[PDB]
Design an enzyme around this catalytic site. Structure first.
Site, PDB file in Angstrom:
ATOM      1  N   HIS A   1       1.009  -1.224  -0.005  1.00  0.00           N
ATOM      2  CA  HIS A   1      -0.004  -0.065  -0.016  1.00  0.00           C
ATOM      3  C   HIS A   1       0.848   1.212   0.114  1.00  0.00           C
ATOM      4  CE1 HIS A   1       0.041  -0.202   4.631  1.00  0.00           C
ATOM      5  NE2 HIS A   1       0.158   1.043   4.405  1.00  0.00           N
TER       6      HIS A   1
ATOM      7  N   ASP B   1      -0.025  -7.569   1.408  1.00  0.00           N
ATOM      8  CA  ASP B   1       0.355  -6.111   1.546  1.00  0.00           C
ATOM      9  C   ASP B   1       1.854  -6.304   1.687  1.00  0.00           C
ATOM     10  OD1 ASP B   1       0.418  -3.528   1.645  1.00  0.00           O
ATOM     11  OD2 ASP B   1      -0.504  -3.388   3.533  1.00  0.00           O
TER      12      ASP B   1
ATOM     13  N   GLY C   1       1.618   6.383   9.080  1.00  0.00           N
ATOM     14  CA  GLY C   1       2.897   6.985   8.735  1.00  0.00           C
ATOM     15  C   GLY C   1       3.824   5.826   9.371  1.00  0.00           C
TER      16      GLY C   1
ATOM     17  N   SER D   1       3.253   2.676   8.381  1.00  0.00           N
ATOM     18  CA  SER D   1       3.022   2.007   7.274  1.00  0.00           C
ATOM     19  C   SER D   1       4.172   1.465   6.623  1.00  0.00           C
ATOM     20  CB  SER D   1       2.008   2.714   6.111  1.00  0.00           C
ATOM     21  OG  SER D   1       0.733   2.746   6.374  1.00  0.00           O
ATOM     22  N   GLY D   2       4.401  -0.050   6.376  1.00  0.00           N
ATOM     23  CA  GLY D   2       5.699  -0.445   5.614  1.00  0.00           C
ATOM     24  C   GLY D   2       6.837  -0.852   6.493  1.00  0.00           C
TER      25      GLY D   2
HETATM   26  N1  46U Z   1      -1.835  -0.824  14.000  1.00  0.00           N
HETATM   27  C1  46U Z   1      -2.765   0.142  13.554  1.00  0.00           C
HETATM   28  N2  46U Z   1      -3.626   0.653  14.509  1.00  0.00           N
HETATM   29  C2  46U Z   1      -2.447   0.754  12.214  1.00  0.00           C
HETATM   30  C3  46U Z   1      -3.772   1.027  11.331  1.00  0.00           C
HETATM   31  C4  46U Z   1      -3.498   1.771  10.181  1.00  0.00           C
HETATM   32  C5  46U Z   1      -2.326   1.789   9.545  1.00  0.00           C
HETATM   33  C6  46U Z   1      -2.105   2.214   8.273  1.00  0.00           C
HETATM   34  N3  46U Z   1      -2.660   1.644   7.268  1.00  0.00           N
HETATM   35  C7  46U Z   1      -3.851   1.995   6.441  1.00  0.00           C
HETATM   36  O1  46U Z   1      -4.257   3.153   6.729  1.00  0.00           O
HETATM   37  C8  46U Z   1      -4.282   1.153   5.591  1.00  0.00           C
HETATM   38  C9  46U Z   1      -3.395   1.321   4.194  1.00  0.00           C
HETATM   39  C10 46U Z   1      -4.467   1.966   3.056  1.00  0.00           C
HETATM   40  C11 46U Z   1      -6.014   1.496   3.441  1.00  0.00           C
HETATM   41  N4  46U Z   1      -5.821   1.189   5.177  1.00  0.00           N
HETATM   42  C12 46U Z   1      -6.391   1.027   5.927  1.00  0.00           C
HETATM   43  O2  46U Z   1      -6.217   0.860   7.148  1.00  0.00           O
HETATM   44  C13 46U Z   1      -7.955   1.247   5.961  1.00  0.00           C
HETATM   45  O3  46U Z   1      -8.823   0.195   5.080  1.00  0.00           O
HETATM   46  C14 46U Z   1      -8.441  -1.329   5.419  1.00  0.00           C
HETATM   47  C15 46U Z   1      -8.895  -1.958   3.796  1.00  0.00           C
HETATM   48  C16 46U Z   1      -8.589  -3.536   3.976  1.00  0.00           C
HETATM   49  C17 46U Z   1      -9.405  -4.110   4.851  1.00  0.00           C
HETATM   50  C18 46U Z   1      -8.804  -3.607   6.262  1.00  0.00           C
HETATM   51  C19 46U Z   1      -9.086  -1.953   6.208  1.00  0.00           C
HETATM   52  C20 46U Z   1      -1.197   1.472  10.610  1.00  0.00           C
HETATM   53  C21 46U Z   1      -1.267   0.917  11.671  1.00  0.00           C
END
Ligand code: 46U
Ligand code: CA
Length: 223
Positions: free
Chosen positions: A40, A84, A175, A177-178
Site C-alpha cells: 500500500h 500487502d 505513517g 505503514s511498511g
Molecule cells: N496498527 C494500527 N492501528 C494501524 C492502522 C492503520 C495503519 C495504516 N494503514 C492504512 O491506513 C491502510 C493502508 C491503506 C488502507 N488502510 C486501511 O487501514 C483502511 O482500510 C483497510 C482496507 C482493507 C481491509 C482493512 C481496512 C497502520 C497501523
C-alpha cells in the site's frame, strides 16, 4: 507509534524511511540493494533514506538513494490488503555499517505470544495527530489468530497476523505503514492496517512475512 518510546538514534539500523518529498512510509533493508515495505506504500518517485533518526534534520549518518524499481506482490489486493508487501530496489548499493544494517528474513514463522519490536515515525496519538521526528519503538506480542479474527471478522487472511494489546493504548499507526515487525531477530511482519490506532479490541494487523520468503528470494535473484 502510539504508547511507545524513543528508540535512540540508529538503534534500528534496518529501518528505512520512504520519501517522495516527505516521509510517507517505513520499510526494511534486507540486503545492500533491497528494501521490503507494504504494497500500500507503492508510488513512483521514491527515494530510500537509510541511517535516519530525525527525518527532518541531517545528522550525518544518512544515505539517500533513489529507487530504480518497485515490485508489488503479484496477488496484492488493495480492497482487502491481502498480500500487502512490496520490494524496492535501490539505484546503488547502500554502504552498510553500524547505522545501516540489514534485517534477516525468517526461516520459519513466529508463534503467538512472541514479543516483537515495531518501529516508525508515524502518529503517536490515539485520538488526534502528532508526528515525531525521531524514530519510535514498541515492544508488542503476537496475538492469537482467534482474537485477531474476532476483532476483524472475515477480514483476516492467512497472510496476516495481529500484534499488540487488546486493552489499547499501545499500537502502530498512520505513517508507520511498511515498517518492520521484528521477532526473534527476524523480520516477521510489516505494518499494514488496523481500525484507528491503539483502540481497545482493535489491535494492529501485520503482513505475514514468513509466507513470502520464497517470493522475496526468487524476486530479488531475478531483478
Ligand atoms: N496498527 C494500527 N492501528 C494501524 C492502522 C492503520 C495503519 C495504516 N494503514 C492504512 O491506513 C491502510 C493502508 C491503506 C488502507 N488502510 C486501511 O487501514 C483502511 O482500510 C483497510 C482496507 C482493507 C481491509 C482493512 C481496512 C497502520 C497501523
Ligand atoms: Ca536525518
Amino acid at each position: 507509534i502510539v504508547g511507545g518510546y524513543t528508540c535512540g538514534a540508529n538503534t534500528v539500523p534496518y529501518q528505512v524511511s520512504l520519501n517522495s518529498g516527505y516521509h510517507f512510509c517505513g520499510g526494511s533493508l534486507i540486503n545492500s540493494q533491497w528494501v521490503v515495505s507494504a504494497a500500500h506504500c507503492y508510488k513512483s518517485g521514491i527515494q530510500v533514506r537509510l541511517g535516519e533518526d530525525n527525518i527532518n534534520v541531517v545528522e550525518g549518518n544518512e544515505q539517500f538513494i533513489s529507487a530504480s524499481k518497485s515490485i508489488v506482490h503479484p496477488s496484492y489486493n488493495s480492497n482487502t490488503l491481502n498480500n500487502d508487501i512490496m520490494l524496492i530496489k535501490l539505484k546503488s548499493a547502500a554502504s552498510l555499517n553500524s547505522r545501516v544494517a540489514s534485517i534477516s528474513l525468517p526461516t520459519s514463522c513466529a508463534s503467538a505470544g512472541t514479543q516483537c519490536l515495531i518501529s516508525g515515525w508515524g502518529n503517536t496519538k490515539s485520538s488526534g495527530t502528532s508526528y515525531p521526528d525521531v524514530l519510535k519503538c514498541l515492544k508488542a506480542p503476537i496475538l492469537s489468530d482467534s482474537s485477531c479474527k474476532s476483532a476483524y471478522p472475515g477480514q483476516i487472511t492467512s497472510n496476516m497476523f495481529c500484534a499488540g494489546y487488546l486493552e489499547g493504548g499501545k499500537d502502530s499507526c498512520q505513517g508507520d505503514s511498511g515498517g518492520p515487525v521484528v521477532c526473534s531477530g527476524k523480520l516477521q511482519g510489516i505494518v499494514s492496517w488496523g481500525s484507528g490506532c491503539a483502540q481497545k479490541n482493535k489491535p494492529g494487523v501485520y503482513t505475514k512475512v514468513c509466507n513470502y520468503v520464497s517470493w522475496i528470494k526468487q524476486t530479488i535473484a531475478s531483478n
